[PDB]
Amino acid sequence: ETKKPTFMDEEVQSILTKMTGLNLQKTFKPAIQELKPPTYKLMTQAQLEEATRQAVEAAKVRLKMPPVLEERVPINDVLAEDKILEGTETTKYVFTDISYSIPHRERFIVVREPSGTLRKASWEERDRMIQVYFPKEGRKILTPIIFKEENLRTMYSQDRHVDVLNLCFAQFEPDSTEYIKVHHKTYEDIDKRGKYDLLRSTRYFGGMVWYFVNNKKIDGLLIDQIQRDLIDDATNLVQLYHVLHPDGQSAQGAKDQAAEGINLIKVFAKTEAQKGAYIELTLQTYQEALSRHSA
Amino acid sequence: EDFDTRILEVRNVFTMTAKEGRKKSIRVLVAVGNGKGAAGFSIGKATDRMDAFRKAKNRAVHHLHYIERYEDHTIFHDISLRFKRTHIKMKKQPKGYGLRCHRAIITICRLIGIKDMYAKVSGSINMLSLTQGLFRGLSRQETHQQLADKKGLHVVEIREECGPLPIVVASPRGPLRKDPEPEDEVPDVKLDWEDVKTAQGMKRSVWSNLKRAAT
């Protein structure tokens, strides 16, 4: 009938791509790593504009958003219960199929328990075993201690939210419970302290917006976009909200009033926004400065 | 007060004289610099070593070179020159590389203000030839602004740590050419076998890349 959009829909990806932004100085910030002497090229204005164009293409690749997946369902499947083996072993065996040309989500990884039960490895056992035999750079077999609540607050205090997300992406699968818990705790710390600019021009801004829109808490991000003269992004945020909440007070108000542009933010501020007063004030201020520039 | 003085060589010179036989004098080589590109050197000659020190260091401050530095830490480009029989090959290096050079070059580089450079001295290792050979090469280095003005093109710096981002370091003050620089499929530049042998993993030396104190 009428399906609500997904994170990977072309319409949503286009909206989130623009709201993210592209900043070549931030996207290609100098990395603190082993250095080599730089190279130099003599370029005309056309060769320079082409070199900058290629950098923009390489940046749009580096800003490719990770897919937002739902939590994976725990694996609890028994293949066999050979009770004659009960009490013959004290430690369980983990068998991993290490055939090279198999996707890691299709590899049979089974566990022979001391009870004699042959079962499929759990999601946590699977990712641990895949790291043992197919080690991925940046991933650890044992969970790093940085992901404890006490150590994440330290990273948040230093405004290292992007490092937290880079570490989580490297350690956990996108559908893991640890991956989703860490991302959500990071998105929430950003909303509470208004640190939305830390994720702009990164591949993590869209996932953050997706989280706020689905949880109906876009008031903080909407205010941040107006204070930064990003009304185009603020208006797209309100439209994405209506698209994902069609049967809502704000979405109907926009239909009844045929609102467009800045009017959408006014409709949303009155009906569904929790900080409706702070938005009208923040929006009023913007219209004033825009009139001063016009005059 | 802003200038520091460093000794590079103290020699005892013996002069045979008509009536007094072998006499002993002192020849001193000293370098001066303020650490901000202004540096010089001078020879001093006196019977007493302390007098030779005073003559050299006071004279050197009146023969100052200005040395251009890239980002105030290294040279603008690789410099390879010969002065008499002393060869000096210098390489531009990134920050954190330090001064991996002949100890005399290290001393002079601290006076100039160069923090990161590799240098190799070959042939005769004559301190005077090395000192004046080093200053000759450092004073004749073309900066990026000079390169842009000479060729009327942008000088674009590509750093691997910054990915494909093009960093314009210098733009011509005059008009900007519209014709790309000709792309000679193969450059006819002369190469150093030592540099190539190293890049190909064929350079084996127990003394290269040894751990040393911070310089």
UniProtKB/Swiss-Prot annotation, chain A:
GO terms for cellular component: mitochondrial inner membrane; mitochondrial ribosome; mitochondrial small ribosomal subunit; mitochondrion. One of its GO terms (molecular function) is structural constituent of ribosome. Changing residue 139 to H: In ODG7; uncertain significance. Keywords: Acetylation, Disease variant, Mitochondrion, Phosphoprotein, Primary mitochondrial disease, Ribonucleoprotein, Ribosomal protein. It is found in: Mitochondrion. GO terms for biological process: mitochondrial translation. The modification N6-acetyllysine is found at residue 148. It comes from the Eukaryota. Signal peptide: none annotated. The keyword Acyltransferase does not apply. Its main location: mitochondrion. It is linked to Combined oxidative phosphorylation deficiency 5: A mitochondrial disease resulting in severe metabolic acidosis, edema, hypertrophic cardiomyopathy, tubulopathy, and hypotonia. Component of the mitochondrial small ribosomal subunit (mt-SSU). Mature mammalian 55S mitochondrial ribosomes consist of a small (28S) and a large (39S) subunit. The 28S small subunit contains a 12S ribosomal RNA (12S mt-rRNA) and 30 different proteins. The 39S large subunit contains a 16S rRNA (16S mt-rRNA), a copy of mitochondrial valine transfer RNA (mt-tRNA(Val)), which plays an integral structural role, and 52 different proteins. Belongs to the mitochondrion-specific ribosomal protein mS22 family. This is Small ribosomal subunit protein mS22. It comes from Homo sapiens (Human). The gene is MRPS22. The chain holds residues 64 to 358 of 360 of the full protein.
Swiss-Prot record, chain B:
GO terms for biological process: mitochondrial translation; translation. Residues 3-67 form the S5 DRBM domain. The keyword Mitochondrion applies. GO terms for cellular component: mitochondrial inner membrane; mitochondrial small ribosomal subunit; mitochondrion. It comes from the Eukaryota. One of its GO terms (molecular function) is structural constituent of ribosome. Disulfide bonds: none annotated. Component of the mitochondrial small ribosomal subunit (mt-SSU). Mature mammalian 55S mitochondrial ribosomes consist of a small (28S) and a large (39S) subunit. The 28S small subunit contains a 12S ribosomal RNA (12S mt-rRNA) and 30 different proteins. The 39S large subunit contains a 16S rRNA (16S mt-rRNA), a copy of mitochondrial valine transfer RNA (mt-tRNA(Val)), which plays an integral structural role, and 52 different proteins. This is Small ribosomal subunit protein uS5m. It comes from Homo sapiens. The lineage of its organism: Eukaryota, Metazoa, Chordata, Craniata, Vertebrata. The chain holds residues 216 to 430 of 430 of the full protein.
